[PDB]
Amino acid sequence: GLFGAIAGFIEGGWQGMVDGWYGYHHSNEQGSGYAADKESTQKAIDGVTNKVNSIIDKMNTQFEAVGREFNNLERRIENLNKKMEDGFLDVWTYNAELLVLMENERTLDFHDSNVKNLYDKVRLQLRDNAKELGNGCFEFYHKCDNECMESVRNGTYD
Amino acid sequence: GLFGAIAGFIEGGWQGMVDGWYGYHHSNEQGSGYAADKESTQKAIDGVTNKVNSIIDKMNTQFEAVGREFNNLERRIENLNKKMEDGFLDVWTYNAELLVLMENERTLDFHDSNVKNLYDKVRLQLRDNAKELGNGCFEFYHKCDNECMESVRNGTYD
Amino acid sequence: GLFGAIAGFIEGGWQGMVDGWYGYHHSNEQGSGYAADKESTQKAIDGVTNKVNSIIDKMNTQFEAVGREFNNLERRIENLNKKMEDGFLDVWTYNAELLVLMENERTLDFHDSNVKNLYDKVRLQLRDNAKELGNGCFEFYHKCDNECMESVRNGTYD
Amino acid sequence: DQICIGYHANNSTEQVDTIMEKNVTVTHAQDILEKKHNGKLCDLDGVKPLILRDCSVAGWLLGNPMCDEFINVPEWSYIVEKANPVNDLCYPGDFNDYEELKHLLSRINHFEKIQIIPKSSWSSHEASLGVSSVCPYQGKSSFFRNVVWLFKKNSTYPTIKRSYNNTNQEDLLVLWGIHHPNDAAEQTKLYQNPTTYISVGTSTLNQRLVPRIATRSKVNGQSGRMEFFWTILKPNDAINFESNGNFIAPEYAYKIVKKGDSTIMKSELEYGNCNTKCQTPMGAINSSMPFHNIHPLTIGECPKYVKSNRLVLATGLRNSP
Amino acid sequence: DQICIGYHANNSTEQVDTIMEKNVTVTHAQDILEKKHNGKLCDLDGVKPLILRDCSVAGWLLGNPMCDEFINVPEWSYIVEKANPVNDLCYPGDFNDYEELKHLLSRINHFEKIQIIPKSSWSSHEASLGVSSVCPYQGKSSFFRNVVWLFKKNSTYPTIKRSYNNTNQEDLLVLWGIHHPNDAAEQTKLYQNPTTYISVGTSTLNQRLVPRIATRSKVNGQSGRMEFFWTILKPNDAINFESNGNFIAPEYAYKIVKKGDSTIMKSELEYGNCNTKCQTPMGAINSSMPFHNIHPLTIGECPKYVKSNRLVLATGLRNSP
Amino acid sequence: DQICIGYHANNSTEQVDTIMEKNVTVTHAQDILEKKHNGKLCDLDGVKPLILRDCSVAGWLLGNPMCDEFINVPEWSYIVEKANPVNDLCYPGDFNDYEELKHLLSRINHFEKIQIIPKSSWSSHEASLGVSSVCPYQGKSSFFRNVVWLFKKNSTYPTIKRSYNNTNQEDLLVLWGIHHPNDAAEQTKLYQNPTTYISVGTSTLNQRLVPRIATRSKVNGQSGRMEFFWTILKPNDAINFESNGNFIAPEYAYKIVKKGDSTIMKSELEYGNCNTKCQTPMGAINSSMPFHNIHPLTIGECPKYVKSNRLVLATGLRNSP
Ligand SMILES: *[C@@H]1O[C@H](CO)[C@@H](O)[C@H](O)[C@H]1NC(C)=O
Ligand SMILES: *[C@@H]1O[C@H](CO)[C@@H](O)[C@H](O)[C@H]1NC(C)=O
Ligand SMILES: *[C@@H]1O[C@H](CO)[C@@H](O)[C@H](O)[C@H]1NC(C)=O
């Protein structure tokens, strides 16, 4: 991952977070659990959905083969016709396969980026008040209670 | 933004900075204002200018339609000729539209990256001596005066 | 560089590190030297090797020109045949040249990303215990001895 | 007390390819390539295709006696023809500009057959005797049903001067023929006159056919050859025939009432009693995918054909093991 | 005391598209698609096109009496012809290999007309009588100006043996014709001889034309047809004519002095008294953009045609609201 | 005590292009475009090409007396022909459907020449006299070696009725010709009969050729023309000839034993006594690169042709100065 978060400094994903693509795990005296970050998740859903649609429609004006026949003494133009129809099909197959390859790489990176930015949003707030463990987690210096946990996710802390 | 700076942790741009693409806002007892970072701005101008030129010239060897006529009993090769001319025009329209789409995404990311790197350049120098607010700004621990402000932009501080 | 490490905050590469693409320079009372990070280097070798192979094979189904002849009164279909063969060659030249251009940009960024992530891996461990100089280096607060240096590269420190 | 950032993993086994890495397992993916078809030939948007079966286009238009199934066909969506139809050109020969005609058929959905010259109208020539063992119908010698093989009457073949004008508002496809005998005695026997011609003319066509007497291989037991011609007679134009022998004359012609969207596909498949919005020569497609890999030649609302075995987009992220 | 990092915003309303997001407002953008034209037909690089108006290429080359505007035309940049020119082939017929000739014209910028066979040189045949009410000039019966319709003189049509050798250093376009009468009596009236031929030969061409007598629809009041042929006579080659009737003979031919870069465009537009470096059949382009969407067929220093409605590159960054 | 992160630099001077930056120096790169060839014509995979040299395909198939080098040629990989071979069609004329034949040759690797009609078998006509000063062999008048120019014997040219049936299991290429004299007296001198024809027929072909007597430019000292025709005689089909003069008759035909992968390339180069896996008309390629820029037309295991001067991938990182 270009951004270093997914399968990087965060070793793996969470089976326990069914709620969305990115979110938080909290743990304290009151207990522990997962909460998805709906905003960045939705920003991700829109981006990916538009991408698919863009991919689909840019390919909607493509080459259509048209049945065309030739007699025994029109071999040259028949062959011309064969090499032309095949030429375009090859061009478009290539276009389709390459776009998918390139855009798959961009989609994986996009998710990686969203995770890193979410990490940074939480880091920029916690500041001194938490030890950054180097695994996606922040161990608090001071006790943090469920409302204190809302606060971080909320974006309003301290 | 993949890099998290533009319309991310820096909420919006500055109408008051007319001088260049990226720069600084300073505020102290002596006053306040904007100063563009000419170096990264120029690095950005060159990159974008070369990109356009590259885009323009890679498309300079394209398909040219050539008027071609056929009688009432050459419908097959006329149609061949029609489907061939249209095939290439479609191929090149697609190429043009896709390049622009992909390269627009790269240009927006490029700017985002330049902003983040400029942020990091300033962060790496200020170190302990400033509270990182989490909005693009550094509140100083100690008084900083216009010459002290030059110093940060200068790249030579402390 | 989109990631700010290569020819960014790390001003230049090391002639003295012949061992791999990315690694470490250490300096202490016992001496000084280079050690490549084999894991990220190998991750980089695999990525780049697959890329080349992918580039090579997506272009393996291309247009082949086929010698084709016409008499003095078949100028229209001869010209058709000329503009068709040239059309595809132009399409594929463009595809080849563009892929290389785009993928060269991605390869340089990929290396930049690997360097930054390696920097971050070391930063996340050293924490308070080292002054981050802002040039790729960490000056230690406490004496670090060759085994202490293994420890950082090892990923197990403190 | 800890707060952690993380991302979704699941039990997904779906894989995507990238330039740098193949078979990356992702939490979610969208397959965009249709690989399934139903293997049948179907109605297109409710409208049955014209499935020629064992007949060829030539066998159908000329009226090969074995192609009675197609004496009057309804509106069609597409036409299906076998690679090598047995029922074509029963009396051996050539069909002039056949492929240009076939091309013109791809832009036609309906024909209406009208009598342009009645069989019962030939006064100085015999009309009921132009039959052949090459073109059987129910065990007996017969002939193409839309044209008339005319012979001499009472040892005479007077010069034919005939004329048809297209009253109809539609373009009219007109077919006629010429007989190339194998010897001078056959020319005598059939037409009396030794040297013959057929002249055909409209406002665009300027034609004169001269019979070629030559010895050749027996095809279906015939050494003679028939050579067939066609033209499109515009509205309010007339077609003039003049001949003194060897004339295979039009009895019927076809009014064109053409939808204009159609194709002749080559297939060995039979009718499948199904309906579809997208047909290929191998089978029909019912899919919401943007691409398919079934066959290049399709008709209807159809996905884009690509030559890929696999097209899968990543939507989710890299799934953890 | 604060120092902040930031970026430029402005009052821009320019929008760009990306794969993930449409209509992103950017501080700066560069439009690269030209959408405007001037709607006129113009001189190309100073050089006026040949605007045929109501004449067709055939009407111009053969010398249709109504096409006197083009008796001698200057050097041209491109040629413009209407979809359906009224002034073509005034005496009805066909123009043999017409489209191959038109193709050859696309690689020609100048013709010089020279007399190869003088009208005043026919001794045993009449030359001033080959005129027709189908080809009027100023109310009177006339005929194609570059060819000669020869008749019998004093009840005789001796065999024509004629010959021209190309002295000129340039390739020469030579046109000739044949008359297909409607009946045997017309053949008698016009040429005396019942069965005719025309033989034409150079070092490459081996030709014999036989007239086709047939009854056909009146086009412009004529049931006869004219059929026109052409060839390119190389330097120092000779063209041999031999005929005993039905011969439409060359009076004039065209020397080719060809720039070699040209096209025949189809347009209903008239001359626009303008100059341009890039011409389309819809209008001229004066642009510094790399792409345009006006029309596929252009000539000159021209942007690349694409079928897009919009091509805009981002240069600046995402503008803040 | 310091630990630093860093990256590899070297003494590399290799450069790559990107969209935003040209000539970026990288530590490592892989050139993927082959720019070198050996400039020779070589054997392909061990198998020598048929290098016609000064002969044309027509000159070779018909048996131009100067093309004896190719009387019986072995299996070939590809064929090489000059732009303008001197030894073609020594007695001037045309070769009917020549380009369609050339196309068919591109799918053939071996011919075997068999005698279909012996020279020693003509009883009522002279066979040893059909020779010409246009087709010299060793200073003496000669003629195409695979066909026979037949004349009248003892002031008579009886009607020829000939027939060949293809016993062989292979398709057979059969060539024949017709002579177009320059005058009626030559027609008399050569064949006696004033008006002639040649009729050719198989199960597919229905042909009658009529000689064209006309005066034309001398090409190689001849005003006569020869016109050559060909057909592919299927297995177990027969070819029927009937003529009363002007007949250039087949002595030899070619059995087709065709590999099916070949091309006719145009080149002025001679044989280079080399072996290769990839041949272009300019020279052979021995490369492990995926692309090359030598020439569009190649044969064998070949890289993809592109029109680039340079294709270099970055593998390493940006090298520091
Ligand atoms: C064809 O017949 C119609 C019906 O009378 C007539 O108006 C038209 O002129 C005719 N066209 C000819 C005679 O070519
Ligand atoms: C054509 O005329 C020129 C001028 O005398 C002559 O040199 C040339 O040989 C002639 N070509 C022929 C007779 O075919
Ligand atoms: C050709 O000759 C073979 C050999 O006898 C024969 O079987 C075949 O029927 C012949 N074909 C004809 C006569 O067309």
PDB file of C-alpha atoms and ligand atoms in Angstrom, chain D residues 216-218, chain F residues 164-167 236-238, ligand 3:
ATOM      1  CA  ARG D 216     -18.914 -28.743 -68.279  1.00  0.00           C
ATOM      2  CA  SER D 217     -19.025 -31.065 -65.260  1.00  0.00           C
ATOM      3  CA  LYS D 218     -22.403 -32.424 -64.186  1.00  0.00           C
TER       4      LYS D 218
ATOM      5  CA  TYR F 164      -8.319 -32.738 -67.794  1.00  0.00           C
ATOM      6  CA  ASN F 165      -9.466 -34.333 -64.563  1.00  0.00           C
ATOM      7  CA  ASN F 166      -7.545 -33.877 -61.346  1.00  0.00           C
ATOM      8  CA  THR F 167      -6.446 -37.319 -60.263  1.00  0.00           C
ATOM      9  CA  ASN F 236     -12.020 -34.917 -58.782  1.00  0.00           C
ATOM     10  CA  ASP F 237     -13.223 -31.959 -60.846  1.00  0.00           C
ATOM     11  CA  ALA F 238     -12.450 -31.644 -64.555  1.00  0.00           C
TER      12      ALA F 238
HETATM   13  C1  LIG G   3     -12.887 -36.868 -62.773  1.00  0.00           C
HETATM   14  O1  LIG G   3     -12.170 -38.087 -62.932  1.00  0.00           O
HETATM   15  C2  LIG G   3     -12.411 -39.033 -61.890  1.00  0.00           C
HETATM   16  C3  LIG G   3     -11.570 -40.277 -62.143  1.00  0.00           C
HETATM   17  O2  LIG G   3     -12.326 -41.252 -62.871  1.00  0.00           O
HETATM   18  C4  LIG G   3     -13.889 -39.384 -61.818  1.00  0.00           C
HETATM   19  O3  LIG G   3     -14.153 -40.269 -60.728  1.00  0.00           O
HETATM   20  C5  LIG G   3     -14.697 -38.121 -61.625  1.00  0.00           C
HETATM   21  O4  LIG G   3     -16.082 -38.454 -61.646  1.00  0.00           O
HETATM   22  C6  LIG G   3     -14.376 -37.168 -62.756  1.00  0.00           C
HETATM   23  N1  LIG G   3     -15.145 -35.956 -62.608  1.00  0.00           N
HETATM   24  C7  LIG G   3     -15.867 -35.474 -63.609  1.00  0.00           C
HETATM   25  C8  LIG G   3     -16.028 -36.373 -64.792  1.00  0.00           C
HETATM   26  O5  LIG G   3     -16.369 -34.369 -63.573  1.00  0.00           O
END
